[PDB]
Amino acid sequence: GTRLAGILFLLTVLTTVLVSGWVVLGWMEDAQRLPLSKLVLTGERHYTRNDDIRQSILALGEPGTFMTQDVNIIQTQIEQRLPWIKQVSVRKQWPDELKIHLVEYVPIARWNDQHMVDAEGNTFSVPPERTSKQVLPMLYGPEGSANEVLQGYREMGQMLAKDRFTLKEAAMTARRSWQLTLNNDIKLNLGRGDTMKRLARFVELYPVLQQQAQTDGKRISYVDLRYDSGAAVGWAPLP
Amino acid sequence: MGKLTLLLLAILVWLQYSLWFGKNGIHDYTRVNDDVAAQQATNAKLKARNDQLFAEIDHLNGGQEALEERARNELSMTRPGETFYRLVP
Amino acid sequence: PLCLFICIILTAVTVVTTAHHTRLLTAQREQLVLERDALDIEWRNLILEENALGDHSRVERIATEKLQMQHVDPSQENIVV
């Protein structure tokens, strides 16, 4: 009498596991085969948009599913289409869910009018519509030396900012010569020699350059600093 | 018995010694790797030193920014219409 | 035992992996010596080309060719620190 109960108690519980396991299998077999049309962008996004990740993930020409999608192929495709992203981390979560973590570059200057450069020296490109609102310095130089010109911009800029100047542009040549551009288009034609001590000479010379420019009603066009304790100043009529 | 174990044990011991020392071993790889690192570091500075000079040589044979600077910095000659200032301590 | 026998395999493979990578660095170390010699020789010929083009008699020759004049003391404004 009691063993029949223990048999039925075990057989029924056995039946309830398989039946519940059968509908759970049906729940997990009709759900794990979906193209994961969802997308979760967790991160501080300033340049990339929600439609950018969607259009780039479908640019492969194939709607991948869950068990038929490599995240290493998605993160690379995002890298090959979005140059302003530093670290892509696309990961799958559940039947119809995705997780993509994005990290952008913070531009502190503009590199050759078409690219930008951050504080760590890294170079990248941003479309001009998403960054025209930014007032950033424009750094010029030969390719591969964005970090070197950045070191010059800071050093020449920190000294120039002491006496309330604004370094708008800083250009460097392949032979390592500098030509700065200040506010109101004041071209400082520096040279290859001691650049910091030439620039420091213009700072001390400027109070006399401006008091003479107002005497004749002229505008400072450019101040050539390629001398030793000397500087030649060009003029231009003011509008 | 233990002789069967002692045989393969001494082989691994001598095989470890031949890995650290000898030819192309660990210490040879370590020493050569340090030399190759220092050489390409020096060659990078030399190539930059040669490229920076070659860039000026490009601007020397009737160029632009390598002949006017020598005229200004070494000969003190200016362009017409430029007021020349001199700073004295 | 046969457990240490596989360590011999793991070590023998490590020897081949270490020897193969080391002989590659030796071939590159020799190539960097040839590169430095080429750079120095290239550096020597460059500094010689600089003097033939940076000669003051030649610099002054072409400086006045593009309308430049020597510094004149009367028209030279002096400023004290």
Side-chain angles (χ1 to χ4, degrees):
Chain A
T2 306
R3 298 308 303 269
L4 297 178
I7 285 301
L8 294 182
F9 189 93
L10 267 53
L11 180 62
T12 315
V13 168
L14 168 65
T15 304
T16 60
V17 170
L18 305 183
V19 173
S20 301
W22 179 73
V23 291
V24 160
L25 183 143
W27 286 0
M28 295 178 177
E29 210 71 20
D30 295 330
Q32 291 287 348
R33 298 182 180 268
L34 295 177
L36 62 80
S37 181
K38 294 189 183 178
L39 172 58
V40 179
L41 297 177
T42 50
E44 182 74 16
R45 304 179 298 101
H46 193 97
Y47 297 113
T48 183
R49 294 184 273 95
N50 300 331
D51 306 74
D52 293 327
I53 301 296
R54 293 213 308 170
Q55 210 71 18
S56 62
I57 200 178
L58 64 88
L60 294 171
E62 183 68 23
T65 65
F66 176 82
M67 292 181 175
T68 62
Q69 180 59 71
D70 188 9
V71 296
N72 296 329
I73 307 300
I74 296 302
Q75 63 180 2
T76 302
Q77 178 73 353
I78 297 180
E79 292 162 3
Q80 298 296 330
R81 298 181 60 89
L82 305 182
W84 58 86
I85 306 293
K86 186 177 66 179
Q87 177 178 344
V88 185
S89 179
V90 47
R91 299 174 64 178
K92 55 187 62 178
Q93 179 180 327
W94 294 356
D96 53 334
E97 185 81 353
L98 203 62
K99 172 258 176 184
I100 298 193
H101 190 17
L102 300 179
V103 179
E104 296 185 6
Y105 289 111
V106 188
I108 67 171
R110 197 157 304 176
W111 183 250
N112 284 276
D113 303 359
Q114 301 293 337
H115 300 65
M116 318 201 78
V117 52
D118 60 351
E120 295 80 17
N122 299 277
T123 176
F124 60 101
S125 179
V126 174
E129 53 269 9
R130 310 188 191 186
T131 179
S132 55
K133 60 175 181 179
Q134 293 178 340
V135 178
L136 264 52
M138 308 184 74
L139 300 183
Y140 300 83
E143 295 182 349
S145 61
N147 191 22
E148 190 192 305
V149 184
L150 183 61
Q151 307 297 342
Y153 168 77
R154 299 179 183 178
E155 191 180 0
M156 299 180 299
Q158 263 71 86
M159 163 181 288
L160 295 174
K162 278 191 173 184
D163 295 78
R164 302 168 183 177
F165 288 87
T166 299
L167 183 52
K168 291 184 173 180
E169 297 178 350
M172 193 186 72
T173 52
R175 54 180 201 85
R176 270 54 188 174
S177 63
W178 300 87
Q179 179 175 344
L180 304 194
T181 299
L182 293 187
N183 189 23
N184 297 326
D185 191 73
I186 298 181
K187 301 176 182 178
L188 296 189
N189 205 331
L190 271 56
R192 191 175 57 170
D194 45 333
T195 59
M196 292 306 300
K197 290 180 174 55
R198 298 175 194 268
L199 183 63
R201 164 154 34 95
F202 165 78
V203 174
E204 186 182 16
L205 202 78
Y206 176 75
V208 192
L209 303 181
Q210 189 67 23
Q211 71 185 17
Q212 295 293 128
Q214 64 179 11
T215 301
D216 302 358
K218 292 295 182 179
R219 182 187 62 86
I220 296 182
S221 179
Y222 63 94
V223 191
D224 203 321
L225 260 46
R226 293 179 291 177
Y227 300 92
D228 193 5
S229 303
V233 185
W235 311 104
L238 53 91
Chain B
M1 41 176 302
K3 181 179 182 57
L4 281 66
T5 298
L6 183 60
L7 181 59
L8 45 81
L9 174 59
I11 296 177
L12 181 61
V13 172
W14 172 80
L15 188 55
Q16 288 187 41
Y17 181 84
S18 185
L19 178 70
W20 294 94
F21 297 160
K23 59 177 64 177
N24 311 283
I26 296 182
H27 285 112
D28 272 359
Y29 180 88
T30 297
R31 182 191 66 259
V32 175
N33 187 33
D34 302 359
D35 294 353
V36 177
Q39 290 299 328
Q40 62 186 17
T42 300
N43 292 17
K45 318 176 192 305
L46 298 177
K47 186 55 182 179
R49 185 198 59 182
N50 293 16
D51 287 328
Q52 182 173 337
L53 183 55
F54 183 87
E56 191 176 32
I57 300 296
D58 202 320
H59 293 156
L60 272 187
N61 46 28
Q64 295 296 326
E65 281 293 329
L67 196 58
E68 185 171 340
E69 180 170 356
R70 297 177 184 267
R72 283 189 148 99
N73 176 74
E74 308 197 74
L75 298 181
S76 301
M77 58 194 304
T78 82
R79 306 181 74 99
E82 295 180 355
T83 308
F84 188 83
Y85 294 83
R86 196 189 196 96
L87 191 61
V88 171
Chain C
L2 204 53
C3 289
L4 283 185
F5 158 96
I6 63 179
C7 288
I8 299 177
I9 305 177
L10 300 172
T11 308
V13 172
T14 304
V15 174
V16 182
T17 307
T18 305
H20 169 260
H21 290 353
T22 309
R23 74 165 62 97
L24 264 56
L25 288 181
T26 302
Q28 187 182 8
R29 184 179 62 182
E30 185 176 348
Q31 186 59 246
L32 290 175
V33 179
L34 271 64
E35 173 175 320
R36 174 162 185 171
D37 299 1
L39 290 169
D40 299 331
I41 271 67
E42 185 188 25
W43 170 254
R44 293 302 184 85
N45 303 131
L46 280 175
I47 71 179
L48 299 183
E49 191 170 358
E50 187 191 328
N51 301 16
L53 304 175
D55 187 68
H56 295 64
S57 297
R58 180 186 179 272
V59 173
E60 197 276 304
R61 181 204 309 177
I62 320 178
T64 53
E65 180 265 356
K66 56 179 184 61
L67 288 71
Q68 284 194 165
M69 289 297 181
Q70 200 82 359
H71 63 290
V72 281
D73 294 357
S75 303
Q76 180 171 145
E77 290 79 3
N78 195 93
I79 295 174
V80 189
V81 162

